[PDB]
Amino acid sequence: ACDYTCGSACYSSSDVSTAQAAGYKLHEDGETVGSNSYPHKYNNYEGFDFSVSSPYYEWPILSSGDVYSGGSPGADRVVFNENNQLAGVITHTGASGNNFVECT
Numbered sequence: 694a695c696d697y698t699c700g701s702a703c704y705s706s707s708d709v710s711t712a713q714a715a716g717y718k719l720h721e722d723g724e725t726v727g728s729n730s731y732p733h734k735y736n737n738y739e740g741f742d743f744s745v746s747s748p749y750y751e752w753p754i755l756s757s758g759d760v761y762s763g764g765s766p767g768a769d770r771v772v773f774n775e776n777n778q779l780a781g782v783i784t785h786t787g788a789s790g791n792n793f794v795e796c797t
């Protein structure tokens with residue numbers, strides 16, 4: 694059940710999969726939502742060791758289980774590439790500034 698732990702938020706494989714599908718879809722159609730225009734390029738400034746090739750894109754995953762639609766994105770993100778492969782699940786929770794830490 695608790696496949697990904699972002700601070701206090703708990704996400705299953707299904708939650709991540711659903712969010713990723715939604716984010717990849719908007720990416721494919723060239724659409725964005727929210728004040729920060731998601732999904733958008735994730736440059737991996739943090740230098741996480743992803744097993745899949747770039748380019749990466751960040752998209753909000755909501756603890757409520759809802760699919761992001763432009764409102765408040767929260768602290769967590771799913772990262773995917775052009776092949777719709779999951780690079781990882783990251784969060785602002787437990788990090789300084791606008792930096793990210795990986796969910797475990």
Ligand SMILES: Nc1nc2c(ncn2[C@@H]2O[C@H](CO)[C@@H](O)[C@H]2OP(=O)(O)O)c(=O)[nH]1
Nearest residue numbers: 729733734735736737738739751791792793
């Ligand atoms: N922390 C962080 N920000 C990134 C990265 N790639 C792009 N950004 C964007 O660069 C800026 C400074 O962090 C923000 O606009 C941020 O977008 P988000 O705020 O949407 O994540 C990344 O790999 N890490």
